[PDB]
Ligand binder design. Structure first.
Ligand SMILES: Nc1ncnc2c1ncn2[C@@H]1O[C@H](COP(=O)(O)OP(=O)(O)O)[C@@H](O)[C@H]1O
Ligand SMILES: [Mg+2]
Ligand SMILES: [Mg+2]
Length: 382
C-alpha cells in the first residue's frame, strides 16, 4: 500500500507527485529539483540516474543514455528507430529484432532494453518519493503519450514492474493534465479542452472531450522532434558564431565544448522566461579561453521565431481533425517546460483571441500532478 504516487515518465524530464492531506505535493529530488532528467550514465565504477547522470554528460558522451522513450515498445527496424539512431552519441544494436542500448560499464560491455532504461528512471523516481515519504512506495499511476499504442503502453507497464512498482493504471499525459486542473469535474453538458504540451524533445497538442467525467481523445497533433532542445540548439549556433567574431576561432568540432555550451544555453533560456537578459559564463571553453557573454530575450525570440510561430500549425490541424472551431474550446491547458516562454504564451493566447490559459500549475509538473491525483482515487484515498 503506502500512498500511491503519480509519475510522469518523460522523454527528457520526469516528475513524481503524491496526493496527501487533500493536496498534491510535487516532490523535489536530492538536488532540490522538482523534475529529474531521464538520463542514465554508466562509468567505470558506478551507475548514475537523473541529475547525477546529466551533470556528467559532456564528460562521458558515449555511455550516457537518454531518449529511451523514443525506443520504448518498438522494433530495431522501425524506420523511427533507424533515423533516431543517427543523432544519439550512444551505440544502439539489434537483439533478435529488438533495439538495445549498448554501453561500457566498469570496463565491461553491457546492453539494455528500453523498458530497462525506463525502469531505471522509474527507480530514481520511486526513490525520490520514498525519501520524501519515509515509506516504501509500491503503487503508481504512470503516464504516457495519448498516441502511445498497446505495445508502448505494455513496455512502460513492464518498466514499472521491473522497477518494483505496481502500476494501478497507464493514463494519457494530456488527460492527467486536465485532471490536475479539475476539468474532469465540471457540469454535465460536455466540454472541450486543448492541451498544448511543448516539452524538451516533443510537441503534442491534444483535444479532449469530457462527458460526465469520461475522457475522449478527439484529435492529436504535433511534432515528435520539436521542443526545448531545439531552442537550445539555435542558441548553441548563435554562440559558436559569436566566439568566431570575438575570439577568432571555431569550437564547432569540439564535442565537450559544444555540450558544455549546450548546458549554459539551456540554463540561460530558463532565465529568459523571467528576465529580459541572461548571462553565460564558461571557464576554459575552447583551448583555455573563457567565455563570458549575454543573450537578450528579444534575440532569443529572434533566433527561434519560426519555431515558435509554427507551433500554431498543429493547433489548427488538431482543431480541424476534431471538427471544432477556436471558439468551441473551453479550456486551454499549458503542459511542458517550454510553455514557460512568454512568446509562446503570447502566440497561443493571440490565436485564441485573448482566452485565458490554465497556467497556474507549473507546466512541467501538470502531468505528474494529475497522475498523483488519479493514483489517490485508485487507492481509495480520494
Ligand atoms: N523556465 C523555462 N523557460 C523555458 N524553457 C523551460 C523552462 N523550464 C524548463 N524549460 C524547458 O522545458 C523542457 C522540459 O520539458 P518538460 O515537460 O519538463 O520535459 P518533457 O518534455 O520530457 O516532459 C526543457 O527543454 C527545458 O529546458
Ligand atoms: Mg512531458
Ligand atoms: Mg513543496
Amino acid at each position: 500500500k503506502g500512498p500511491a504516487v503519480g509519475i510522469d515518465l518523460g522523454t527528457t524530464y520526469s516528475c513524481v507527485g503524491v496526493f496527501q492531506h487533500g493536496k498534491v505535493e510535487i516532490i523535489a529530488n536530492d538536488q532540490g529539483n522538482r523534475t529529474t532528467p531521464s538520463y542514465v550514465a554508466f562509468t567505470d565504477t558506478e551507475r548514475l540516474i537523473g541529475d547525477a547522470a546529466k551533470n556528467q554528460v559532456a564528460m562521458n558522451p558515449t555511455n550516457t543514455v537518454f531518449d529511451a522513450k523514443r525506443l520504448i515498445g518498438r522494433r530495431f527496424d522501425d524506420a523511427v528507430v533507424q533515423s533516431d539512431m543517427k543523432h544519439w552519441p550512444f551505440m544502439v544494436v539489434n537483439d533478435a529484432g529488438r533495439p538495445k542500448v549498448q554501453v561500457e560499464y566498469k570496463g565491461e560491455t553491457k546492453s539494455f532494453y528500453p523498458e530497462e532504461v525506463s525502469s531505471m528512471v522509474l527507480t530514481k523516481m520511486k526513490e525520490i518519493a520514498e525519501a520524501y515519504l519515509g515509506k516504501t512506495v509500491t503503487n503508481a499511476v504512470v503516464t504516457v503519450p495519448a498516441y502511445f499504442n498497446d505495445s508502448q503502453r505494455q513496455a512502460t507497464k513492464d518498466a514499472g514492474t521491473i522497477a518494483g512498482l505496481n502500476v494501478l493504471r497507464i493514463i494519457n499525459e494530456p488527460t492527467a493534465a486536465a485532471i490536475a486542473y479539475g476539468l474532469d469535474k465540471k457540469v454535465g453538458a460536455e466540454r472541450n479542452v486543448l492541451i498544448f504540451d511543448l516539452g524538451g524533445g516533443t510537441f503534442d497538442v491534444s483535444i479532449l472531450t469530457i462527458e460526465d467525467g469520461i475522457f475522449e481523445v478527439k484529435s492529436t497533433a504535433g511534432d515528435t522532434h520539436l521542443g526545448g532542445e531545439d531552442f537550445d540548439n539555435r542558441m548553441v549556433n548563435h554562440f559558436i558564431a559569436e566566439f568566431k567574431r570575438k575570439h577568432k576561432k571555431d569550437i564547432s568540432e569540439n564535442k565537450r565544448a559544444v555540450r558544455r555550451l549546450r548546458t549554459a544555453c539551456e540554463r540561460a533560456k530558463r532565465t529568459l522566461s523571467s528576465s529580459t537578459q541572461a548571462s553565460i559564463e564558461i571557464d576554459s571553453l575552447y583551448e583555455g579561453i573563457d567565455f563570458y557573454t549575454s543573450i537578450t530575450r528579444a534575440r532569443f525570440e529572434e533566433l527561434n521565431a519560426d519555431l515558435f510561430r509554427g507551433t500554431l500549425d498543429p493547433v489548427e490541424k488538431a482543431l480541424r481533425d476534431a471538427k471544432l472551431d477556436k471558439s468551441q474550446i473551453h479550456d486551454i491547458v499549458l503542459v511542458g517546460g517550454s510553455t514557460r516562454i512568454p512568446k509562446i504564451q503570447k502566440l497561443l493566447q493571440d490565436f485564441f483571441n485573448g482566452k485565458e490559459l490554465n497556467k497556474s500549475i507549473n507546466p512541467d509538473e501538470a502531468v505528474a500532478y494529475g497522475a498523483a491525483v488519479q493514483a489517490a482515487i485508485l487507492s481509495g484515498d480520494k
